[PDB]
From a paper:
TMEM16 scramblases dissipate the plasma membrane lipid asymmetry to activate multiple eukaryotic cellular pathways. The TMEM16 superfamily is comprised of Cl- channels and dual function scramblases/non-selective ion channels. Our results show afTMEM16 thins the membrane to enable scrambling and that an open hydrophilic pathway is not a structural requirement to allow rapid transbilayer movement of lipids. Scrambling by the TMEM16’s is modulated by two signals, binding of Ca2+ facilitates opening of the groove while the properties of the membrane determine whether the scramblase can thin the membrane enough to enable lipid flipping.
To improve the quality of the density of the lipids near the pathway, we carried out symmetry expansion and additional rounds of 3D classification, which yielded one class with an additional four resolved lipids, for a total of 32 resolved lipids, 16 in each monomer. The observed lipids define the nearly continuous interfaces of the scramblase with the inner and outer membrane leaflets near the dimer interface (lipids D1-D9) and illustrate how the poses adopted by individual lipids result in the profound remodeling of the membrane induced by afTMEM16 near the lipid pathway (lipids P1-P7). The C18/Ca2+ structure reveals how the scramblase reorients the lipids that approach the open scrambling pathway. The downward slope of the OL starts at D5, a well-defined PG lipid, and progresses towards the open groove as P1 and P2 adopt distorted poses with their headgroups becoming increasingly tilted. The IL bends upwards and P5-P7 become increasingly tilted as their heads climb around the intracellular portions of TM3 and TM4, coordinated by the hydrophilic side chains of T341, K345 and T334. At the pathway, P3 is sandwiched between TM4 and TM6 near the constriction formed by T325 and Y432 and its headgroup points towards the extracellular side, such that it is contiguous to other OL lipids. Notably, P3 and P4 are oriented with their heads facing the outside of the groove. The distance between the phosphate atoms of the heads of P3 and P4 in the OL and IL is <22 Å, showing that the hydrocarbon core of the membrane is thinned by ~50% at the open pathway. One unexpected feature of our structure is that the extracellular vestibule of the groove does not directly interact with the membrane and no lipids could be resolved there, as they cross the open groove at the T325 and Y432 constriction. The wide intracellular vestibule is embedded in the nanodisc membrane and, at the open pathway, the P3 and P4 lipids have opposite orientations, suggesting scrambling might occur in the groove region comprised between them.
Residue numbers in the entry: 12 to 463, 487 to 660
Amino acid sequence: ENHHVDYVIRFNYGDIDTPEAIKKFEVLLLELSEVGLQTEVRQGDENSLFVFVRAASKKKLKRAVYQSRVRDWLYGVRNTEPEPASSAKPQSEAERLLVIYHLITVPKAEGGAGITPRHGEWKNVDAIFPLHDEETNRQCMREWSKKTFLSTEDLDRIRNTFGEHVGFYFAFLQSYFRFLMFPAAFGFSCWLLLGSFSIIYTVVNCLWCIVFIEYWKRQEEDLSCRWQTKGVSAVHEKRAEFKPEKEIRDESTGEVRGVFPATKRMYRQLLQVPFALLAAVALGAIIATCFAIEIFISEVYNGPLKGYLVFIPTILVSALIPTMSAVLLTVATKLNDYENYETQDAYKVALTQKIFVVNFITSYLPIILTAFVYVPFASRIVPYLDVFHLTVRPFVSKEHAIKARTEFSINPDRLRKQVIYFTVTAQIVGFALETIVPFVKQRVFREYKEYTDEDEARFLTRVRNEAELEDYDVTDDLREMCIQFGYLALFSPVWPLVPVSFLINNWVELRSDFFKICVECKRPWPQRADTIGPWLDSLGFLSWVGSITSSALVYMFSNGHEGPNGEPTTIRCWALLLTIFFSEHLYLIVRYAVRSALAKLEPPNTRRERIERFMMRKRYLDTVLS
Ligand SMILES: [Ca+2]
Ligand SMILES: [Ca+2]
């Protein structure tokens, strides 16, 4: 059905001249041939060729699979001795696709073709992608669209098709959804019986966050042992953009390495603090200014055309936060390049960590402003917001803009409504923008280009369609789930139905993300992983911060949703600070206890890998060494 194709290499010739294009193309085909791959060339687009790649021989494929397993075993990623090369069948499609992707991409000295798409020698090579297995995808979709949980076999199927990175994301999402049943039930019970800002709800929520994060750390270790990816960072793919200072030739492996001093990278990484403060200043200024405009227009201004003026600050936020975030991403990418980052995974993790500052600010600063600035203050702030009358000025006359004043009277519903927005309406709108609109845009751009050799015209047209799809990044889905967890950990006392909303959304999220991968994206090459990465630390940080924000909220809103109704008088600053101190330190103590208790419970795959290391050394001692 896929015509035995392993990868499609898109070669762009449009932006270069014919002689250089022919020379580069011959070099590409020669490298593919010399690394043991069989090529077939077809017209991809009007400006690109498709190089269809396949293992030239079953013997060569078995040899490459055996060498990959041997490298994994030598670097300690697996403990079982690699089976001989005559029995070296790829145990899944993910393994064959990974071996062939390495053959295509790892440098010539490392034993492959050095095709680095969108790099120096290969800027014409635009994309290297495998083909979706449409029947398997549709079977999986229809099968687990009718179940509650995905089986371990279902997760293994995802890993065997898309690799362990996508597999880890779906395993984490399934575990998060399963753990969300407890806070969903408990928060519905509290919303029914206690209402919001309940001490018991906040305590149970912090305890649940602790338990889920520690359980997932343990489960990640177990799953990386079960998928044979534990310690996979030892064989992390180098990135071709790495600028070494000196070239050293280690004696263990007869190769030059290209060393770069770690302390120099740390000096360059000192610039992350100024970047973080820049992003905080810019994004917080935009967000707080738009919040002040929103407050003025919606609650201080009392002139004509109030809806058409209250839609102003939401528009300005929706236009300016994406733009400022794109600028900050450009700055973060330039800083990530300045830091040298030998490996692609280190580069990706560092960029994700820089972007997490922007994510935190843009996701949580609105609710933080409403909760800890608008509610306690803003009876002392709205006198300073008369200056924002000019935002309404190009619509209303100067006198009508001035005589539009009212008793402020803080809206005791503002905070609950903002939390309900971010945890329900944002979820629905994000589902729409994430699955529906890209799908419709793809179908529209297809029928636009489709409206205005005979035996492979269908396969070739569907390959040309797959070539237009988006490049899936599992980091985006992990980011979304971690930001959602942050909402739960930080602001769930305001509205205890947040975990119910997240439970429903995450059941739908598993299926809709799998659909997006299979239908709206090119099939990702089966990248490996032994963890969700920096997102685990992000979740730990968010739960820590939530122990502070939730206790502050429970203190401030003890008397109800109004709490300090605009005045900071009722808030005793020592009692708020003492609440925060004891809550955060009870949190840290309970987290230490839970982590230490879970460290005493070794999971089965972890214990099996330890015993297997022992058994491998015993086999070595029994065969050689007498
Ligand atoms: Ca979504
Ligand atoms: Ca998603």
